[PDB]
Design a protein around this ligand. Structure first.
Ligand code: FES
Ligand code: K
Ligand code: MG
Ligand code: MG
Ligand code: MG
Ligand code: MG
Ligand code: MG
Ligand code: MG
Ligand code: MG
Ligand code: MG
Lengths: 49, 135, 86, 100, 137, 97
RNA sequence: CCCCACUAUGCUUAGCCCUAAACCUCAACAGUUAAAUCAACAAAACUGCUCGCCAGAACACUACGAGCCACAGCUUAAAACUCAAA
């Protein structure tokens, strides 16, 4: 089974700024999607599931 | 070995004491900074209590002498049809313009209140200001 | 008995609609408290029992009015989520 | 000759305004959710006003509008409460758009 | 003119008429809706009795008297005897909250009478006689 | 010290307290027109203060005036005098159809 | 318990009787809101001062005594035997 990589270095500092949420990958995606929705406002089926 | 008794003293006092007792082998990274530049109040847990009887908060209402002039102006002339622009830090409303003229005339020696208020309205009308009495 | 008749608790019928006239009369007597008064008077309510119910009714009305006020106040924020995704 | 806080507060437009009830103020739309317009008018809290039926499309992000203020902060203390409940928003009525 | 639910006041000059008769001249249907019976008496404006019917006089007995269908039947019976005497329009005065309070009025209508007004005269003492003690059920 | 500091005084923007429609007016038992405005048209029932909007003091004066006028021969008990049905409706009660 | 009838009684007058879950189940007065807020629940927690009252349960709103317009009453109010709880 694929193993999650180390989430910090020797100095103990986590690599990702959302580490302490415990869900850095999920909340990083929500942050990226929420950020895209903002830029649009500033600027402004059958075969897929 | 440490202490999670957050209601017993402060993180500084609990840390300082356990360092002396040898329970904590090394000081935490923040300890030396706290010592050199401590907060104004040591962060000690307190339970907020409710006031009873003749105990009242010391906070005082903020009032100014010109507030008396503003209350009368709003009563007599209402709020100006001109809109407040609270974004401009130097905005002056019709009431503020009235208050400044009212203050100028008071410094010229006039002391009556009912007379000092009628002369101010005339001055602004001469300057082109619109003062529609509410009643 | 000594008063004039056909003034008190009297509703006129419109266009032969007796059902709507009866509902209006019943609504009048209900709002004025006569219906509940008639019912409570079929058997004697003892003074200690009347005080208990009157005290219970007055506290329930206050509690319901205070619970309605709270929901009205806290329903202002029932609008759609302004910060969805955060 | 450094200005003091007491001086800043005395001469601030928000201080000079007095009570906020029935005061006309200029607001700015900064966020829109469907037909809910979030308008800042210089206070602590924004107000939320529904898009007017007439000229609804003229109200966009950045559009400056005229408001009649009712409360700077909607708060109320409910029975059996030690503090006040706040909805963290001001109460204001949207009148229209401000134009030059 | 707009409709008024308030009855015309005697001595004033109203324009309302029913078969050429004023409100003060319309006969009265007195409905006593008790808990175990319903009594209906139709009288003239001069207090002349014209018809009487009750659930008991219509062959109902015991708990059957205290039903809506029994009161409706009593209304039809009183209406028939009143219609023979020349009554079309009636003023309804109902006292009591029994089951035949509304049903007795329906029977009067099905019997050929037209109700122009409804009056409640349920006796409410303003302080009066002590009612019987509560029941333990 | 400093001129711009707040000064102690009473609220200059304070609004006056609310007043009932009858605040400052004499309530006489002979003024049946006024008293009739606070009784039910159909039943003559005296309205509670939640319907009349009166304060405790005027609610009491109206109540005492009505009871005096009724038993002294000035005011009916079981219904509102029909003469006063077209007077200003000052009570928060909706009845008809 | 449910239905009906009717009495003492509920009312008045003049005398008695003197009881109540007579209970906000909060003694009177004065003061405090800072301390520890505080066994629990009730009704936020206390201080000063005074009077009244209490000292395991049950026996016991009892016995005896005394007082009382009370005489099948009220007030005051024990003991013996019994238990390791209440
Ligand atoms: S409010 Fe002043 S008498 Fe009613
Ligand atoms: K009690
Ligand atoms: Mg007797
Ligand atoms: Mg009596
Ligand atoms: Mg008591
Ligand atoms: Mg004492
Ligand atoms: Mg003992
Ligand atoms: Mg006893
Ligand atoms: Mg004894
Ligand atoms: Mg003895």
């Amino acid at each position: 089974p694929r193993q999650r990589a180390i989430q910090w270095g020797e100095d103990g500092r986590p690599f990702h700024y959302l580490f302490y949420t415990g869900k850095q990958s999920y909340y990083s995606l929500m942050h990226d999607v929420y950020g895209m929705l903002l830029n649009l406002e500033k600027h402004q089926v059958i075969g897929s599931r | 070995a440490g202490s999670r008794l957050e209601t017993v003293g402060s993180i500084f006092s609990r840390t300082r004491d356990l360092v002396r007792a040898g329970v904590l082998k090394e000081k935490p990274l923040w300890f030396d900074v706290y010592d050199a530049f401590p907060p104004l109040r040591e962060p000690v847990f307190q339970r907020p209590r409710v006031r009873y009887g003749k105990a009242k908060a010391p906070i005082q209402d903020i009032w100014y002498h010109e507030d008396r002039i503003r209350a009368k102006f709003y009563s007599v002339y209402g709020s100006g049809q001109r809109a407040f622009d609270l974004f401009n830090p130097n905005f002056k409303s019709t009431c503020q313009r009235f208050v400044e003229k009212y203050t100028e005339l008071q410094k010229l020696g006039e002391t009556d209140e009912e007379k000092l208020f009628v002369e101010t309205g005339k001055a602004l009308l001469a300057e082109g200001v619109i003062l529609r009495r509410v009643g | 008995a000594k008063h004039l008749k056909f003034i008190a608790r009297t509703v006129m019928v419109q266009e032969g609609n007796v059902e709507s006239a009866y509902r209006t009369l019943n609504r009048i007597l209900t709002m004025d408290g006569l219906i509940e008064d008639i019912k409570h008077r079929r058997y004697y309510e003892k003074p200690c029992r009347r005080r208990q119910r009157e005290s219970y009714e007055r506290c329930r009305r206050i509690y319901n009015m205070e619970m309605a006020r709270k929901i009205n106040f806290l329903m202002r924020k029932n609008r759609a989520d302004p910060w969805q995704g955060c | 000759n450094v200005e003091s806080f007491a001086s800043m507060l005395r001469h601030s437009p928000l201080t000079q305004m007095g009570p906020a009830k029935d005061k006309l103020v200029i607001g700015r739309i900064f966020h829109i959710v469907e037909n809910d317009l979030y308008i800042d008018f210089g206070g602590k809290f924004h107000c939320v006003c529904r898009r007017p039926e007439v000229d609804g499309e003229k109200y966009q992000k950045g559009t400056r509008v005229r408001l009649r203020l009712l409360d700077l902060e909607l708060t109320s203390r409910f029975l059996g409460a030690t503090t006040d409940t706040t909805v963290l928003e001001a109460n204001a009525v949207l009148l229209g758009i401000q134009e030059s | 003119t707009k409709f008024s639910i308030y009855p015309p006041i005697p001595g004033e000059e109203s324009s309302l008429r029913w078969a050429g008769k004023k409100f003060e001249e319309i006969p009265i249907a007195h409905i006593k809706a008790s808990h175990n019976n319903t009594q209906i008496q139709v009288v003239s404006a001069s207090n002349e009795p014209l018809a009487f019917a009750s659930c008991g006089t219509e062959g109902f007995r015991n708990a059957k008297k205290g039903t809506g269908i029994a009161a409706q039947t009593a209304g039809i019976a009183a209406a028939a005897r009143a219609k023979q005497k020349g009554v079309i329009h009636i003023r309804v005065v109902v006292k009591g909250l029994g089951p035949g309070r509304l049903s007795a009025m329906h029977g009067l209508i099905m019997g050929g009478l037209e109700v122009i007004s409804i009056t409640d005269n349920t006796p409410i003492p303003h302080x009066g006689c002590r009612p019987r003690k509560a029941r333990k059920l | 010290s400093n001129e711009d500091l707040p000064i102690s005084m009473e609220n200059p923007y304070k609004e006056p307290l609310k007043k009932c429609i009858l605040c400052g007016k004499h309530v006489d038992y002979k003024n049946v027109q006024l008293l009739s405005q606070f009784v039910s048209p159909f039943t003559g029932c005296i309205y509670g203060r939640h319907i009349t909007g009166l304060c405790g003091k005027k609610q009491k004066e109206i109540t005492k005036a009505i009871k005096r006028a009724q038993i002294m021969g000035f005011m009916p008990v079981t219904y509102k005098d029909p003469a006063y049905l077209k007077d200003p409706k000052v009570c928060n009660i909706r009845y008809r159809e």
